[PDB]
């Protein structure tokens, strides 16, 4: 279950109401890595398999560990890849509500992409979850240009990347419980807040 390309594969004539775009952590497998599958299963329970499209950021995003040290905490090629997926969602399914997330390098990628996005598309992302956010200190827990009420950051005590370092310590690898419960809970709540049900 570590690769999902529902947006790329999806039929434009039968668009899902909710599209989730997720970026994995460094060196992780597929395009969802270790946390994305848990979030996806719970979104599908809430909205149904036909109700939500799960899309990982693959393509040019190689999730190379060394790219954590670059200015935006990931590469320019990776940002272009995720921007392209938000633009594909907006073109293919203009009425869908979007939600996003990322872990570790993927959280820096999600923040850089949303910062650069056209505002009319950015404003369709009803909620974003970030785990082990490598730019947490530098950005003061926020995503630039995106509202605090639509953001949820999961940063464990002792996870040094949340406090301005790039050292990987054991708390960085402990976000499994959050991806199984509070992170899908937040995303579902933020989609229902604007779509009703």
Q: Where are the domains of the chain?
A: 1-197
Please, what is the end-to-end C-alpha distance for the chain in angstroms? 28
CATH superfamily entry for domain 1-197: Alpha/Beta hydrolase fold, catalytic domain (3.40.50.1820)
Instruction: Check if 104 is active-site.
Output: yes
Instruction: Check if 159 is active-site.
Output: yes
Q: Are 22 and 102 in contact (CB under 8 A)?
A: yes
Sign, CA torsion 91/57/165/173: positive
Distance (Å, rounded) from C-alpha 130 to C-alpha 142? Answer: 10
Resolution for the entry shown, Å: 1.7
Indicate which residue of 26, 38, 159, 178 is catalytic. Answer: 159
64 contact partners, CB below 8 Å, separation of at least 6? 26, 27, 75
Indicate which residue of 104, 113, 123, 165 is catalytic. Answer: 104
Distance (Å, rounded) from C-alpha 88 to C-alpha 84? Answer: 6
Distance (Å, rounded) from C-alpha 80 to C-alpha 76? Answer: 6
Instruction: Check if 172 is active-site.
Output: yes
Residues in the chain: 197
3-state secondary structure of 188: helix
């Amino acid at each position: 279950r570590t690769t999902r390309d529902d947006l790329i594969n999806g039929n434009s004539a039968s668009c899902a109401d909710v599209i989730f775009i997720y970026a994995r952590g460094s060196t992780e497998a597929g395009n969802l890595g270790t946390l994305g599958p848990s979030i996806a299963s719970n979104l599908e329970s809430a909205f149904g398999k036909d109700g939500v499209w799960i899309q990982g950021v693959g393509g040019a995003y190689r999730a190379t560990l060394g790219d954590n040290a670059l200015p935006r905490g990931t590469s320019s090629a990776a940002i272009r890849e995720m921007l392209g997926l938000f633009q594909q969602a907006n073109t293919k399914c203009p009425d869908a509500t979007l939600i996003a997330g990322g872990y570790s390098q993927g959280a820096a990628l999600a923040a850089a992409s949303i910062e650069d996005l056209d505002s009319a598309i950015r404003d369709k992302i009803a909620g974003t979850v970030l785990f082990g956010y490598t730019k947490n200190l530098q950005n003061r827990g926020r995503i630039p240009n995106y509202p605090a009420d639509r953001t949820k950051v999961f940063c464990n005590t002792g996870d040094l990347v949340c406090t301005g370092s790039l050292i990987v310590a054991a708390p960085h690898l402990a976000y499994g419980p959050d991806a199984r419960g509070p992170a899908p809970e937040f995303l579902i709540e933020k989609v229902r807040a604007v779509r009703g049900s």
